[PDB]
Each structure stands twice: as structure tokens, then as C-alpha cells.
Amino acid sequence: IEPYYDTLQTILTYLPYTMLGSDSKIFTFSNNYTRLEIPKDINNSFSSLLREVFEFAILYKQLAIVVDRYKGTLVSAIK
Amino acid sequence: PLLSQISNLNIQQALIIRELLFTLLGHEGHYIQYSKRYDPTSQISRIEGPDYKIAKNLDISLKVITKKLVKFGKFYSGLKSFIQVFDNNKFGKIVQKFCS
């Protein structure tokens, strides 16, 4: 199928850095880490699958932002 | 070797790790250098620790991860310079015991 199917193992090379909520050479965050742009040269199927995988990355990034922001600011003991 | 000259990711990762081991102790490296704002003469500059700049040719993901880890060298250098200033008789037993 290789000759008849074109798409960018290379994804798995740069995927761990994106999963940990960090910028990547092929995946870039924007708008205060609220959306992630899937590049060109990722055909329909792979993009549709990644949209499910990238849910973890964005959610974890949001949680990390919250933890880093409210680490020692809140006064209430419960929070 | 120039950082731009190297294109492989593994080589860059190993090189930055080797340079980072010394950075975490407050020393300069070949690819992590002190910011021009850091003046060792000033007391407050030494206490607050040095700020580091990362070479522009590093990979973006490695650059981000390194920028997170660099802060640990800053804290270590600041504490080490804190001991060499606040550990004398004029600052009292409380501060001396804290320096311990």
C-alpha cells in the first residue's frame, strides 16, 4: 500500500513531547493552550484518530496550568 | 560542534543532557549561557540566582523542556550564594540555624 497511500513512525517521534503539554515541531498550541493545530500531510483518517488522542494532551495542559497557577495563592484550606 | 550543524534528535538530546548536568549546579555550558543581566557583583543578583538563555538552534520541544528544568539551577545557585552571605554573627542565631 505504501506507493498508493501518502501521509507523514515519525508521528510517534514527536508525540511524547506533545502529550506532556509542550510545543512540537509538527504540533503547535495556540490561544493560551486552548486549541491544537493538526498540520498538513496528515490525511483524514489519521487526523480523526489523533483528535481523540489529543484530548488527553489539551486536558492535561489545562490541569497543569491550573496547578502551576494556584499552587500557593489560594488561602482556603479546602481548595 | 555548532548546535545548528547537528540535525539528529538523539544527538541533540544527549548533548543537552550533558550540558544540563552542569547547568543544574549553577555552571555555564556550551549551549546554556548566563543572561547578560546577571552581574555577580550585585548582592541581590547573586541571591536571586542567574537567568539562563538557551541557544536558538535547539529543537523546539527540547527547548521548552529545558526552559522548565533550568529553574532548578537558578534556585541552587541562589541558595549557595545565600549561605555565603547570611551565615555570620550579625544576622543572629535564627538565620544561622536556617542556613544550616
Concatenated DSSP letters for A11-52?
A: HHHHHHHHHTT---SS-EEETTTTEEE--SS--HHHHHHHHH
Which residues of A lie inside 8 Å of B (Cβ-Cβ)? 13-14, 17-18, 20, 22-25
For this PDB entry, the determination method is cryo-EM
Least Cα distance to A34 among A70, A66, A69, A59 occurs for A59
Resolution of this PDB entry, in A? 3.6
- Contact criterion met (CB below 8 Å) for B51 and B93: no
CA distance B44 to A15: 41
Quick check: A17 and B61 CB within 8 A? yes
Q: SS3 for B53?
A: strand
Lookup result for grid cell 480523526: A48
For residues B19 and B30, what is the distance between their CA atoms, to the nearest angstrom? Answer: 7
Identify the CA nearest to B67 among candidates B77, B78, B53.
B53
- Binary contact (B65, A17; C-beta < 8 A): yes
Neighboring chain B residues of A24 at a CB cutoff of 8 Å: 60-61
Enter the C-alpha cell of residue B75.
Answer: 534556585
Angle B20-A32-A50 from CA coordinates, rounded to 5°:
85
Q: Report d(CA A66, CA B63) in Å as an integer.
A: 22
Residues of B in contact with A23 (CB under 8 A): 60-61, 64
| Structural Rg of chain B based on CA atoms | 17
B68 phi, psi to nearest 5 deg: -70, -45
Joined grid coordinates for residue A75? 488561602
Contact B61 A24 (CB under 8 A): yes
Residue A23 to residue B60, Cβ atoms within 8 A: yes
Dihedral, B3, B5, B7, B9 alpha carbons, nearest 10: -20
